[PDB]
Amino acid sequence: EKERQNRLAEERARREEEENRRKAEDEARKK
């Protein structure tokens, strides 16, 4: 269970950092 939950949690965090770098490069284009 913990293996599964941690895997899903890192998948979530990776998607989150994807969106963060994405908004970052968007703002960069606005610059």
UniProtKB/Swiss-Prot annotation:
UniProt protein name: Troponin T, cardiac muscle
Tissues expressing the protein: Heart. The fetal heart shows a greater expression in the atrium than in the ventricle, while the adult heart shows a greater expression in the ventricle than in the atrium. Isoform 6 predominates in normal adult heart. Isoforms 1, 7 and 8 are expressed in fetal heart. Isoform 7 is also expressed in failing adult heart.
Source organism of this protein record: Homo sapiens
Reported disease: Cardiomyopathy, familial hypertrophic, 2: A hereditary heart disorder characterized by ventricular hypertrophy, which is usually asymmetric and often involves the interventricular septum. The symptoms include dyspnea, syncope, collapse, palpitations, and chest pain. They can be readily provoked by exercise. The disorder has inter- and intrafamilial variability ranging from benign to malignant forms with high risk of cardiac failure and sudden cardiac death. Cardiomyopathy, dilated, 1D: A disorder characterized by ventricular dilation and impaired systolic function, resulting in congestive heart failure and arrhythmia. Patients are at risk of premature death.
Superkingdom to which the source organism belongs: Eukaryota
Function: Troponin T is the tropomyosin-binding subunit of troponin, the thin filament regulatory complex which confers calcium-sensitivity to striated muscle actomyosin ATPase activity.
Record-stated family: Belongs to the troponin T family.
